C-alpha cells in the first residue's frame with residue numbers, strides 16, 4: 102500500500118535545539134519524583150475512582166469509569182510502578198483493570214474511537230508488566246469490540262490495540278484492519294503539507310451534525326496541535342509493526358511541521374497557527390505526546406539520517422521546557438502533573454487546565470528517557 106506524497110519542510114534554525122543541554126539522569130529522576138509525589142497524593146484523593154478528563158481551576162474532579170480518558174490514570178500508576186516497583190501502585194492499578202474488564206463485559210459507555218486509549222495504558226500495560234490474564238482478557242475483548250465497530254488522526258493510537266491482538270492470537274484479520282486503517286488515516290487525515298486534518302463533521306448523506314463529534318483545531322485552515330502530535334506518535338508506533346519506510350518520511354513531514362511552529366520556549370500553542378504574542382493558551386499535552394513520538398521514532402531512524410541528532414536534541418529541548426516551566430509545583434490533592442493544556446477550545450472545556458492524557462504522556466516521556474521502557478502500546 103502507498104502513502105501519498107507530502108511536503109517535508111526542512112527543520113528551521115536547528116540550532117535552537119542543537120544548543121540545548123541534554124537532560125541528565127539527575128534531572129529526569131527529580132522530575133519523576135516530583136510527579137510521583139503528586140500521584141501518591143492523588144491516589145488518596147481518587148481511591149478506586151478516576152480523574153475527570155481535565156481539571157477545573159487545576160483541580161481534577163472525581164468520576165467513575167465512563168469517559169474516554171480513564172485509562173490514562175491507570176497508565177500513570179503503571180508508569181510510576183515501572184519506576185519504584187511499589188506494590189501499592191500495582192494493587193490499585195489492578196483494581197482499575199478489573200473495572201475495565203467489567204466495563205467491557207457490560208459495554209458501559211463504549212465508543213470504538215477510544216478503545217485503544219482506554220484499554221492499552223490500563224489492561225495491556227498490566228499484561229506487559231506481569232502477564233495478568235484478566236488484563237489480557239479485557240484487552241482482547243476491547244480489540245474485538247474495535248473490530249466489529251470498525252476516520253480521525255487519533256486512530257493511529259487506537260489501532261495499536263489491534264496489532265497487540267494480532268500478536269497475541271495470530272489472527273491476521275486484526276492486522277489487516279490495523280494496516281488498512283493506518284493507510285486510510287495517513288492518506289485522508291493528513292494534508293499534503295504534512296498538517297493533520299479532520300474527516301467529516303457532518304453526515305455524508307444528509308449533512309446533519311454528527312452527535313459527539315467535536316471541532317478539532319481553530320478552523321478548517323489551521324493545525325490542531327494535539328492532532329499533529331497524535332500523528333507524530335501514532336506513526337512510529339505503527340511503523341514498529343509495519344516496517345514501511347514511507348512511514349518514516351511521513352513522520353519527518355509531520356514532525357518537522359510541528360517543530361517549525363513551536364514558539365520560543367518550544368512548547369506548542371493549542372493550535373499551531375498561534376505562536377508568541379497571540380495570547381492563546383498552550384497545549385502542553387500536545388508537546389508531551391510529540392516528545393514520546395520522537396523518542397519512539399528515534400529507535401528506528403537510521404544513523405545516517407541528517408536530522409536524527411536534531412530530533413534527539415529537539416525532544417530533550419521540549420521535555421526540559423515542560424519540566425522546568427510547565428510541571429506542577431503545588432503538591433495538593435487533585436493537582437495535575439502538568440499544567441496548561443487545552444481539551445476542547447470550541448466547547449470551552451479544559452482550556453488552560455491540566456488534563457489526564459497530558460499527565461500520562463509527560464510521565465511516559467520521563468520514564469522513556471530514564472529507563473529502557475517496554476511499551477504498553
Ligand SMILES: CC(=O)N[C@@H]1[C@@H](O[C@@H]2OC(C(=O)O)=C[C@H](O)[C@H]2O)[C@@H](O)[C@@H](COS(=O)(=O)O)O[C@H]1O
Nearest residue numbers: 169212214215255313314315327444445448449450
Ligand atoms: C467523549 C468521546 O467519546 N468523544 C469526544 C471526545 O473526542 C476525543 O477527544 C480526543 C482529543 O484528543 O481531544 C481524543 C479521542 O480520540 C476522541 O475520541 C472529545 O472531543 C469530547 C470533548 O467534549 S467537549 O468538551 O464537549 O467538547 O467530546 C466527546 O464527544
